[PDB]
Amino acid sequence: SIIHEDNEWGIELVMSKVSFKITLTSDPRLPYKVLSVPESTPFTAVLKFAAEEFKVPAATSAIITNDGIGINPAQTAGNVFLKHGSELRIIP
């Protein structure tokens, strides 16, 4: 959120990241993916990226906590990390 007046060259600030370990619990191997995500990333995009990694449809998948708590995807990844930590499940 620092305003750069004249950035003609297109320099970008790389944002702080949060990491999630996401397990596909419908597969008996319990495969997991660890995603490193810029903090402001909408959680909808994390769901999409995870679903693509597991080759399941994003439209019919949801991410929940390891305690079974639903996660409103209309939130930033940073806020999801602060509230729920890193250990998440992807499910139908």
Residue numbers in the entry: -13 to 78
Question: Paper's wording?
Answer:
The modification of proteins by ubiquitin-fold modifier 1 (UFM1) is implicated in many human diseases. UBA5 is a non-canonical E1 activating enzyme that possesses an adenylation domain but lacks a distinct cysteine domain. Binding of UBA5 to UFM1 is mediated via an amino acid sequence, known as the UFM1-interacting sequence (UIS), located outside the adenylation domain that is required for UFM1 activation.
Crystals contained two molecules of the UIS-UFM1 fusion in the P4322 asymmetric unit where the UIS from molecule A interacts non-covalently with the UFM1 of molecule B. Interestingly, the UIS of molecule B does not interact with the UFM1 of molecule A, but with the UFM1 of a symmetry–related fusion molecule. The UIS binds to UFM1 on the opposite side of the C-terminal surface of UFM1 and adopts a U-shaped structure with Trp 341 sitting at the base of the U-shape. Upon binding to UFM1, the UIS buries 1148 Å2 of total surface area. In this structure His 336 interacts with UFM1 Glu 38 & 39 and mutating these residues perturbs binding. Indeed, mutating this histidine to alanine decreases binding to UFM1 as well as activation of UFM1.
